[PDB]
Amino acid sequence: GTILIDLSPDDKEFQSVEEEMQSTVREHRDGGHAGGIFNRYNILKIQKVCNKKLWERYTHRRKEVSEENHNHANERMLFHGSPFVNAIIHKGFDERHAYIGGMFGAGIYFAENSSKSNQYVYGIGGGTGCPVHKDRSCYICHRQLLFCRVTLGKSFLQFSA
Amino acid sequence: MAHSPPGHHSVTGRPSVNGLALAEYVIYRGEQAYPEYLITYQIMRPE
Ligand SMILES: O=c1cc(-c2ccc([N+](=O)[O-])cc2)oc2ccccc12
Numbered sequence: 001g002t003i004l005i006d007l008s009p010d011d012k013e014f015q016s017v018e019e020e021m022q023s024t025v026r027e028h029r030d031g032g033h034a035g036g037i038f039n040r041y042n043i044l045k046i047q048k049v050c051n052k053k054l055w056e057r058y059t060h061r062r063k064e065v066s067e068e069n070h071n072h073a074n075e076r077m078l079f080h081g082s083p084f085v086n087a088i089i090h091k092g093f094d095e096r097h098a099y100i101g102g103m104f105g106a107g108i109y110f111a112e113n114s115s116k117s118n119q120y121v122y123g124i125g126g127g128t129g130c131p132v133h134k135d136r137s138c139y140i141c142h143r144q145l146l147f148c149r150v151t152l153g154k155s156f157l158q159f160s161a
Numbered sequence: 162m163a164h165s166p167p168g169h170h171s172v173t174g175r176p177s178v179n180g181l182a183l184a185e186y187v188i189y190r191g192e193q194a195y196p197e198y199l200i201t202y203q204i205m206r207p208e
């Protein structure tokens with residue numbers, strides 16, 4: 001039930017997603033090891049993901065959280081990078097997209113920094129880099145990230161290195 | 162998949178050393194996210 005609609009680079013919606021992508025790049029403490037060495041991206045395509053069933057699943061749960069948190073879903077737009085992006089867009093997030101060894105337990109992780117999610121595109125720690133060249137810092141191969149609508153509700157605050 | 166801490170719907174990882182890092186978040190139910198945009202890109206070699 002998923003269809004992908006291409007956005008024109010002229011569309012203000014394309015532009016505001018691109019801007020969030022570019023403006024949230026930072027330097028990482030691994031010096032580029034996991035995600036590569038870069039200060040910005042070349043954006044090749046942005047597509048809107050439409051799946052009625054997955055959308056209503058999302059909104060049904062959003063309402064539940066909202067009613068548990070003084071009518072405040074605490075919804076954000078956040079980045080997610082994963083080897084499983086194609087399963088995610090067709091079947092939704094589930095158990096199988098969790099980070100079992102993440103510092104905040106086994107759950108599904110999202111970032112405000114696009115460059116942080118970029119570190120997971122080829123796997124945890126960048127895996128072995130791109131399929132074609134085995135290069136975590138590959139400048140040739142096409143990468144994909146998700147920009148996602150996320151319900152946080154009442155969020156537990158963990159201070160941390 | 163683990164559970165949220167009792168009485169919470171998610172975890173926020175707040176950076177407490179790297180002054181430039183933004184926050185990271187964790188949810189424990191798939192239904193709390195919708196994958197709205199697919200962005201295809203390349204990283205660019207600095208000059
Ligand atoms: O975008 C993210 C994807 C992932 C991630 C982690 C593990 C898997 N996995 O188990 O294959 C997938 C994506 O982890 C993050 C951690 C911190 C911030 C953002 C992310």
Ligand SMILES: [Zn+2]
Pocket residue numbers: 130131132133134135138139140141
């Ligand atoms: Zn490559």
